[PDB]
Structure formats: structure tokens, C-alpha cells
A paper describes a structure:
However, while 45LNIYQY50 (R1), 47IYQYGG52 (R1), and 137VTQVGF142 (R5) formed unbranched and elongated amyloid-like fibrils, the 129TASNSS134 (R4-R5 loop) segment formed scarce and more amorphous structures. The 45LNIYQY50 (R1), 47IYQYGG52 (R1), and 137VTQVGF142 (R5) segments bound the amyloid indicator dye ThT and demonstrated dose-dependent amyloid fibrillation curves with short lag times. 45LNIYQY50 and 47IYQYGG52, which are overlapping segments from the R1 repeat, adopted very similar structures. Both segments, as well as 137VTQVGF142 (R5), adopted a classical amyloid steric zipper architecture, with two possible dry interfaces between paired β-sheets. The β-strands were oriented parallel to each other along the β-sheets. These three structures are class 1 steric zippers, as defined by Sawaya and Eisenberg according to the organization of the β-strands and β-sheets. In each of these dry interfaces, the chemical properties governing fibril stability, i.e., buried surface area and shape complementarity between sheets, resembled those of eukaryotic steric zipper structures. Specifically, the R1 45LNIYQY50 and 47IYQYGG52 segments and the R5 137VTQVGF142 segment formed fibrils that bound the amyloid indicator dye ThT and formed canonical amyloid class 1 steric zippers. These segments contain Gln49 or Gln139 (marked in bold in 45LNIYQY50, 47IYQYGG52, and 137VTQVGF142), which are critical for fibrillation and cannot be mutated to asparagine without interfering with curli assembly. The R1 segment 45LNIYQY50 and the R5 segment 137VTQVGF142 also induced fibrillation of Aβ1–40. In agreement with the hypothesis that the steric zipper segments serve as spines of CsgA fibrils, we found that the D-peptides also inhibited the fibrillation of the R1 45LNIYQY50 and R5 137VTQVGF142 spine segments in a dose-dependent manner.
Curli proteins are produced via dedicated and tightly regulated cellular processes, and their fibrils mediate host cell adhesion and invasion, lead to immune system activation, and scaffold bacterial communities known as biofilms. The two key players in curli fibril formation are CsgA and CsgB, the major and minor curli subunits, respectively. CsgA, a 151-residue protein, consists of five imperfect sequence repeats (R1-R5), defined by regularly spaced serine (Ser), glutamine (Gln) and asparagine (Asn) residues. The first and the last repeats (R1 and R5) form amyloid fibrils in isolation and are critical to CsgA seeding and nucleation by CsgB, while the other repeats (R2-R4) contain 'gatekeeper' residues that temper the amyloidogenicity of CsgA.
Residue numbers in the entry:
A (entry chain B), B (entry chain A), C (entry chain A), D (entry chain A), E (entry chain A), F (entry chain B), ...: 1 to 6
The structure:
Amino acid sequence: VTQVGF
Amino acid sequence: VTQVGF
Amino acid sequence: VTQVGF
Amino acid sequence: VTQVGF
Amino acid sequence: VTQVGF
Amino acid sequence: VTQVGF
Amino acid sequence: VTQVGF
Amino acid sequence: VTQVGF
Amino acid sequence: VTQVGF
Amino acid sequence: VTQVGF
Amino acid sequence: VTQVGF
Amino acid sequence: VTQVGF
Amino acid sequence: VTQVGF
Amino acid sequence: VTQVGF
Amino acid sequence: VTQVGF
Amino acid sequence: VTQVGF
Amino acid sequence: VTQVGF
Amino acid sequence: VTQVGF
């Protein structure tokens, strides 16, 4: 699980 | 941004 | 952006 | 954008 | 955009 | 399952 | 499951 | 940005 | 599960 | 930014 | 920024 | 589990 | 910044 | 578990 | 900054 | 568990 | 457990 | 357990 939020 | 991963 | 992954 | 994947 | 995939 | 939305 | 939303 | 991963 | 949102 | 991972 | 990891 | 938020 | 890790 | 928030 | 680790 | 917040 | 906050 | 806060 990899999550990138911006 | 809302992220839910499992 | 709403993301749900499983 | 709403994404649901399983 | 609404995406549901399973 | 690959989802791309923009 | 890969989700890209923007 | 809210991220929940497990 | 990879999630990218922006 | 709120992150919960387990 | 709130981070909880376990 | 990797979470990046900004 | 609040961090809880265990 | 790696969390980066800023 | 509040940090609790165990 | 690695947490970086700023 | 490594926590860096600033 | 390493904690750095500033």
C-alpha cells in the first residue's frame, strides 16, 4: 500500500 | 484527497 | 479525489 | 473524482 | 468522474 | 484494476 | 489496484 | 489529505 | 494498492 | 494531513 | 499533521 | 505501507 | 505535529 | 510503515 | 510537537 | 515505523 | 520507531 | 526509539 496525496 | 487502502 | 482500494 | 477498486 | 472496478 | 480519472 | 486521480 | 493504509 | 491523488 | 498506517 | 503508525 | 501527504 | 508510533 | 506529512 | 513512541 | 512531519 | 517533527 | 522535535 502506497499512498501519495497533495 | 482521501485515500483508504488495504 | 476519493480513492478506496482493497 | 471517486475511485473504488477491489 | 466515478469509477468502480472489481 | 487500473483507474485513471482527471 | 492502481488509482490515479487529479 | 487523509490517508489510511493497512 | 497504489493511490495517487492531487 | 492525517495519516494512519498499520 | 497527525501520524499514527503501528 | 508508505504514505506521503502535503 | 502529533506522532504516535508503536 | 513510513509516513511523511508536510 | 508531541511524540509518543514505544 | 518512521514518521516525518513538518 | 523514528519520529521527526518540526 | 528516536525522537527529534523542534
